[PDB]
Symmetry: D2
Subunit: 414 residues, 4 copies
């Protein structure tokens, strides 16, 4: 049994793909494999006040199909919370509500996703030219192989630790913050260092500040203060379907300009509202004569070691061009992520995939990897297209159109 | 040929009815009559900056059917403006865009509306009990009569001038502001009086101030300054479908409480942003040493007379308890509207319509007039239900659910 | 030793008076008596997030003297927080910071206030015409009498409980909320009823929601939902110095118009941001499937009784026109305040104070009670002038100008 | 006659110096020379809606002296506009009002400024050690020389045109926009090109769009849309007095970090509000079917030539890597400014001024140029300290403290 398309991973990207498949009149067979027991959308960072960074209109389908049964609005309606939501006049749902939306959409699908199923490799199917791929799937009990004419890789961002710092029992990456934080006896995390100046760093500091009154927090970041995230309307355009065209067709000089001017729309920046809230907290503590937030600016974390009952963080100060130590109970590294790497699961098939001068996967407009004539199977990327398709690659801005484009591509080639 | 339902008037209310009819699986025949040449939704007040007072999610259908082909979101999509609109992050479209939406929805309808068709009377059909009504329709060429088992009256708010003031060539009601303003020579309206403290009054003054630099404006209103419109989420809940029930099923005492506390959600009030804009304009003029906005507070317009080339406005000052005369080129009365009244159109049928103690029409929860057993035809009201259904009656807050309940009622009784 | 002026009470109003006295070139002797141990400015309601309802520019002096050593700006500067405050771009300080400001201003004063000193009576001095008043002061150790040519009564708002509800250990007035709440066992206040729809009611509910995850709260109020406080620039003009004149010189009809239209600037209303925050909390709880905020609208508390371990609150529902019982651990009545009344303190002197038709004190523009020729001493009111001077009487909007006018009046008559 | 200090230029910077001198108890003689007829603070860009980029609290003196007779608040009070201003709740005055403030402050000043007086050179005074400088002043009638022990150079930003483009009758720099625009016939500027993506560019485009309904505008900028200006509280800390020290004492690495992360607080960026307003304008035009704003992104103006009745603008597109022409009536270059440079004015004294490795002027913390032993006179810079003191150098953020430090330095050396 050969599937038209197999999806690796089941986060929002492949979920929108599943939705696109179901709404398409094309009869395409599919299977999706997710390593986790269920949809798990950055749960480590599902903090109490966390808000979506995108508008609810930017959901799984609406931009493609304004009357989708899978729209966020449909979700609200079924949950009897559309009227209440509209009264709030906030375009940005909470992360918690959105996570619910995902699970609701997944349930509504006719198709059934295979959970607890980790794709370990993707191999050339039999014959030349290669007309199918073999997908090696590991479940807790067994292992098996499924065959597919096309494959869509959507395995998500990859946590990035500072150079020279390894995650450990008292050194956490932000992605696994709540995982670790639930364990730990409250009276044992009185001193926390948080590395980073981005959205993750800010949210974690805010959470620590609100959730227990006596925690002392060291916010260590290279900038002089949080840099504001740019969500102004002209800016939000870089995420419009048509802007993806602009970026794709543009010269390397144009692509650079994109990053040079508009990297602030997403990377190493903090939403305006979160910034103000942190500032208000700092101000009120000063008034109360009880400072707890220590902003260590123009600095990086360059090392961590456990010494007795204290995690010793080595900080490099740019202002003084000197390193020094910082003893705390826990170091949380909110130091960001690396892009999805298409090459991960590809071994041999990577031989048939085409790189450019600088070594990067070549990708067609329809998110399909460029291959030699030895490969006729479609390898599509949702994620890992930062170089070719732009800033929207890892984000939720363009789920509907990207998924739709991929489905159409697959139908066209069938 | 007897129709299941005939709609009198084709503003947003009956348009949502037409949509509800089309989306309903029930096979109901219908005709709609509009006296104008086309949909004309308060065009006299389609000022440059005018913004909807209701969220785009409150459209013709979405609250009833979250995936309607007639949703505002569908409209944006077809116009290729959904992405752009979402980037704006504003829940409130312009009046101009919304007017487009209505025309777009009307065109989509399978059914064809009869324009240039004024309903002049509604009369008892033949027989007893009365099982149909006769609808007298006047077109430019002819007159005719069509028969219907149910009728839905939605003829809109009725302009209300101040007592003792009649509309005239230099005394206008706000509803016909642009109609009269586009005609006049700019250099002839250097002095304008605007009566009222509501949304209409404020928008007109703002428009006059922005449009031409030398117009002097007298803003005459009973309050000491504009009163802010309440659109905070809890007060807004009075427009929830469920709040209609609360109002309907509530005692007279409870109904009175709605008006006493929440009349400021709509009547005699001005949107926060419009108020601030006017204030900024006044401030900047003062700085420039060139005042043009004269706020005449705690006052009422009590008369107008044309004297040579001047419109003389008689103003009563509450502070002073005396009247005085104000000479301008034009008096614009933004003094509001009276509710729809099915009274005039009904004639003989009114005999079979039951009134309450205070002589008002009794109306069922499904918007259907209470009748004697002599009358079995449904007379539904969209508008004119302020006293039975509450503050949502004349507004856009509840189009989807009201229209849906009327359609269901008609189907149930068939 | 006869003082030119004696101040009864030392809240913000008399503090601004003290400041006005010191800044005036006039050499006037004074004494101030405060019953409490120190300045105590609604400490029972000093909740964590509470924000001033008035701009920092509306402080003790700035409107009168734009370069006062007692300005809020001077306070920030001395505290080394001015730059930090300006960066925040918020016109509204916290209540906690403002309380600090008051104490700071009090300390800076040359004059020394007499604390722990309750004024128990004000009596006619010796002679005719009565030329001085005698002020009976009770300290913890002794009692004494001081003599003054003028007296300024500023004893503040008086807590008002719902009719037929008396405060006790499980039935609190909002004014003493933190007094009772602190140290009460957390696990013993799992069910709280809060009566009222005003700023106090809203802040307490929000605090309860924020500070304890388990607490179930019943918000009981006569309106259908919180009514927004009007702070828009034009309505806010009623607090301008010149608007005091407009109100004072205006007819009874005009005065009524102020209250009819602009009572929503202060009474029985809630700040926009606090409303939205409560709504967001309610929404998120619904999403989480854990409702805790119960809004009991169109209702009022009509009785309370202690029954075993429960406080039984009798609620009257306007919608149903019936009464029912609600069991909670504590009833907090945030039911507002009555105006200051010089009546009690005055005794005999009241004979020489002229009343108008409705039993109310006549007051001159300069806040000086109207007296018979039998009395030449100045009795000034800061507070209790709602009926003569308007909505600014109990508020912080006009401290600088009122205090300045009182000082000037006293100097003029000397 | 030898002055303690001579100021070159009389914009806000030297105005604050004059104020600092006055308020200082030190008896220092001074003269100020301005080449214009009066204070002329970027009048070419005094557009109708233009708003200060800095809080009113950041005025001539307040941060140094919180009760200055020259504060913005004092200004408002004297103008009888303090109450009205506070009611507006806007920290940011209009540029128009601020310009008034400057003139008002100038008039208050006890000592008189010499207008129509252009400093043409600064020379070594006679003898050894060099204890004075000679200032060559050219008035319309005569020329003269004044002597001073110290000199403060504050001659402002210098307009910068694109490379290969020269200002002309139909090619304007933004700084002279209104100067040229008030002259031209309206019907002759139907096609305008505006180069730049900064605050100047945005304001001019907005003005052109609002002013006349039929102007077509080409907005040419290197970014893919306007980049938001960062004004959030933490990033704004870079303008704190203490942040000057951090920048000054910091390594080159640290200084680079300030620019790398926080350049977006001021350069090549646009205020949030202005961006949103432009976007709304674009949206409404599309709805109206009448587009007029053409955003030419990822592009640079590289040339301009007059050809008959057309200004032909050569545009380089980074996306296509090619150049093309656009014909308009006028090209406005809003392409920014170069820093103040004491270089030109200094001449021979420059020999006595020490440069660093990269050939830049070495400046002490007090703003005083580093000199050779023979030179004992103080040469202070207000402006032109970007490389030593940081991003505050050309701005209004720090007038009070900088001026105060310079005055103190002069007194201390005296
Ligand atoms: C805390 C936080 C919050 C947000 C965001 C990031 C972070 C860290 N993002 C960006 C983020 O990339 C986005 O929200 C989604 O996670 C992207 O969807 P994906 O399906 O592509 O990755 P995603 O990570 O969601 O899905 C990957 C899945 O594949 C599974 N998987 C990986 N390898 C596998 C294998 N070998 N076999 C089987 N399964 C495998 C993983 O288990 C995982 O479930 C965002 N962006 C935005 O625009 N707005 C927003 O609000 C947010 N919110
Ligand atoms: C300037 C302005 C702006 C707004 C609003 C009012 C005003 C004055 N409204 C309220 C307004 O009532 C609502 O928007 C609709 O007009 C109501 O729809 P009807 O369909 O009920 O009115 P209208 O929309 O008033 O429908 C009546 C129509 O029937 C026609 N008609 C009358 N008599 C007839 C006859 N005898 N025969 C045939 N046709 C006849 C009329 O010609 C008219 O077209 C509003 N509310 C809100 O909630 N949000 C908002 O943004 C606005 N905007
Ligand atoms: C929780 C809360 C918060 C606010 C406000 C009210 C409340 C309840 N207000 C209004 C409030 O009225 C105002 O802030 C001041 O309290 C009024 O000053 P007095 O100085 O007039 O009152 P208070 O400030 O009430 O002055 C009274 C003092 O006199 C003392 N006293 C009474 N009788 C005495 C006696 N016989 N002998 C000696 N001393 C006696 C009392 O002890 C007390 O210290 C307000 N308004 C606004 O415009 N903005 C705001 O932010 C707020 N904030
Ligand atoms: C349109 C616009 C608007 C703003 C700003 C810039 C621009 C272009 N700025 C920055 C701007 O640099 C600042 O507002 C002041 O102009 C700087 O003060 P200066 O006194 O140093 O220069 P400024 O240019 O104001 O004054 C210099 C003066 O010296 C005179 N002069 C020059 N050479 C001379 C000579 N040889 N002899 C005699 N006189 C001579 C000139 O005539 C001129 O009047 C700003 N920044 C901010 O933080 N907030 C804001 O709101 C603004 N607003
Ligand atoms: N509420 C939400 O929906 C939410 C929450 C969290 C994250 N997200 C999303 O997830 C994505 C990533 O955000 P992110 O904050 O996790 O990552 P991020 O944007 O890459 O931010 C990483 C930060 O850590 C800094 N850093 C790197 N090495 C460091 C070191 N050795 N010491 C100190 N700081 C160091 C980076 O500084 P430099 O770049 O200057 O080197 C940067 O400030 C974004 O798309 C974001 O929007 C969303
Ligand atoms: N942008 C939009 O979508 C828009 C624009 C305009 C209107 N509308 C809507 O249309 C409806 C009507 O609003 P409206 O502003 O036209 O009317 P309105 O709300 O009824 O207000 C009428 C005003 O005139 C005053 N008034 C009455 N008699 C007067 C007199 N003799 N002299 C001076 N003033 C007098 C009223 O004062 P009192 O009430 O105190 O007596 C009131 O302030 C509302 O639903 C509104 O939201 C919407
Ligand atoms: N309302 C106000 O108070 C107000 C008004 C206007 C200005 N200002 C102030 O004045 C100062 C300067 O602002 P500004 O906007 O005048 O200048 P600016 O910040 O320097 O911005 C100049 C812009 O022109 C661009 N540019 C450079 N060469 C170009 C070319 N050949 N073709 C097209 N575009 C080109 C720059 O792009 P790149 O830099 O990316 O190369 C940049 O976006 C700031 O302090 C600003 O805040 C204040
Ligand atoms: Br968005
Ligand atoms: Br719903
Ligand atoms: Br690193
Ligand atoms: Br560890
Ligand atoms: Br970890
Ligand atoms: Br949190
Ligand atoms: Br492009
Ligand atoms: Br540290
Ligand atoms: Br796409
Ligand atoms: Br698509
Ligand atoms: Br709404
Ligand atoms: Br679209
Ligand atoms: Br009319
Ligand atoms: Br307008
Ligand atoms: Br109810
Ligand atoms: Br309904
Ligand atoms: Br329905
Ligand atoms: Br205020
Ligand atoms: Br400070
Ligand atoms: Br109590
Ligand atoms: Br709180
Ligand atoms: Br619930
Ligand atoms: Br007063
Ligand atoms: Br005064
Ligand atoms: Br403008
Ligand atoms: Br600022
Ligand atoms: Br004033
Ligand atoms: Br250039
Ligand atoms: Br040039
Ligand atoms: Br030219
Ligand atoms: Br020029
Ligand atoms: Br530093
Ligand atoms: Br030519
Ligand atoms: Br400094
Ligand atoms: Br200083």
């Amino acid at each position: 049994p050969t599937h038209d398309v197999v999806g690796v991973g089941f986060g929002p990207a492949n979920l929108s793909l599943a939705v696109a498949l179901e709404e398409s009149p094309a009869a395409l067979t599919s299977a999706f494999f997710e390593r986790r027991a269920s949809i798990s959308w950055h749960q480590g960072m599902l903090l109490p006040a966390a808000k979506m960074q995108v508008s609810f209109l930017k959901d799984l389908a609406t931009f493609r199909n304004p009357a989708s049964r899978f729209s966020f609005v449909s979700f609200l309606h079924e949950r009897g919370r559309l009227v209440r939501f509209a009264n709030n006049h906030d375009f940005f749902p909470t992360r918690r509500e959105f996570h619910d939306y995902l699970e609701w959409a997944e349930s509504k699908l006719a198709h059934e996703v295979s959970y607890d199923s980790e794709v370990t490799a993707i191999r050339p199917g039999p014959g030349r030219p290669v007309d199918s791929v073999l997908v090696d799937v590991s479940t807790p009990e067994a292992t098996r192989t499924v065959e597919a004419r096309n494959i869509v890789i959507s395995t998500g961002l990859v946590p990035r630790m500072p150079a020279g710092v390894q995650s450990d029992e008292f050194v956490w990456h932000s992605s696994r913050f709540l995982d670790h934080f639930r364990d730990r006896d409250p009276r044992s995390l009185r001193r926390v260092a948080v590395a980073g100046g981005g959205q993750s760093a800010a949210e974690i500091v805010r959470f620590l500040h609100d959730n227990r009154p006596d925690t002392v927090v060291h916010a260590i970041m290279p900038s002089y203060g949080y840099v504001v995230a740019d969500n102004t309307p002209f800016a939000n355009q870089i995420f419009d379907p048509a802007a993806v065209d602009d970026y794709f067709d543009g010269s390397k000089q144009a692509k650079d300009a994109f990053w040079r001017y508009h990297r602030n729309t997403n990377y190493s920046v903090v939403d305006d509202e979160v910034i103000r809230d942190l500032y208000r907290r700092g101000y009120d503590d000063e008034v109360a004569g009880a400072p707890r937030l220590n902003f260590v600016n123009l600095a990086h974390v360059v090392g961590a070691k456990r010494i007795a009952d204290d995690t010793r963080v080595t900080v490099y100060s740019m202002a003084r061009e000197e390193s020094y130590d910082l003893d705390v109970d826990v170091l949380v590294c909110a130091t960001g992520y690396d892009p999805m790497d298409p090459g991960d699961l590809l071994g041999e098939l990577a031989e048939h995939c085409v790189q450019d001068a600088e070594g990067r996967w070549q990708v067609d407009r329809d998110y399909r990897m460029v291959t030699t004539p030895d490969l006729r199977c479609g390898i599509y990327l949702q994620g890992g297209t930062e170089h070719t398709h732009g800033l929207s690659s890892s984000l939720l801005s363009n789920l509907a159109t990207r998924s739709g484009e991929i489905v159409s591509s697959i139908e066209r080639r069938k």
